[PDB]
Amino acid sequence: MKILVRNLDRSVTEAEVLELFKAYGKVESCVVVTDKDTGKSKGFGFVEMPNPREAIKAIKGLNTLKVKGYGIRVKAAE
């Protein structure tokens, strides 16, 4: 399952996001975009968890979690 992550602070790192999704299951890939072209609020990420039941658990678990002061938004790409 492909998972979309939004509202990332420019200080959020790929390893930070990875550690969060790994609380829920196996993570096959984690792409995080926090540039200066994104704002300290509008970074985004794309996470692949191959077990869809783990992905769903992570979506429910992590959506609206504050990371660096912004509630992140997590949902399936589909």
Numbering used by the authors: 19 to 96
Quote the study that presented this structure, word for word.
Here, we identified an RRM-containing protein in Acinetobacter baumannii that we called AB-Elavl, starting from a protein similarity search with the human ELAV-like protein HuR. The single RRM domain is characterized by the presence of two consensus sequences: a highly conserved sequence (RNP1) of eight amino acids and a less conserved sequence of six (RNP2). The typical secondary structure consists of a β1α1β2β3α2β4 topology and the RNP1 and RNP2 are localized in the internal β1β3 strands. All these results suggest that A. baumannii express an RRM-containing RBP that shares RNA-binding properties and characteristics with the human HuR for the ability to bind RNA AU-rich region, although with lower affinity and specificity.
The crystals diffracted up to 1.6 Å resolution: they belong to space group I41 with one molecule in the asymmetric unit, a solvent content of about 50%, and a mosaicity of 0.3°. The X-ray structure showed the domain of an RRM domain: β1-α1-β2-β3-α2-β4 with an additional β5 segment present right before the C-terminus of the protein. The two conserved amino acid sequences, ILVNRL and KGFGFVE, are localized at the level of the two internal strands of the β-sheet: β2-β3. The solved structure shows the absence of the first 18 residues in the electron density with respect to the cloned sequence. It is not trivial to tell whether this is due to their high mobility or rather to their loss due to some protein degradation before/during crystallization. It appears quite clear that the fold of rAB-Elavl is very similar to that of the model used for structure solution and, in turn, similar to the typical RRM. The greatest discrepancy between the two structures is in the region involving residues from 50 to 58, just before RNP-1. In our case electron density is missing for those residues, confirming thus very high mobility. The average B-factor along the sequence is, in fact, about 35 Å2, confirming an overall rigidity of the structure, with the only exception being the above-mentioned region 50–58 where temperature factor values are extremely high. The structure of the bacterial RRM domain appears very similar to the eukaryotic one but for the presence of an additional short β strand and a more flexible central region.
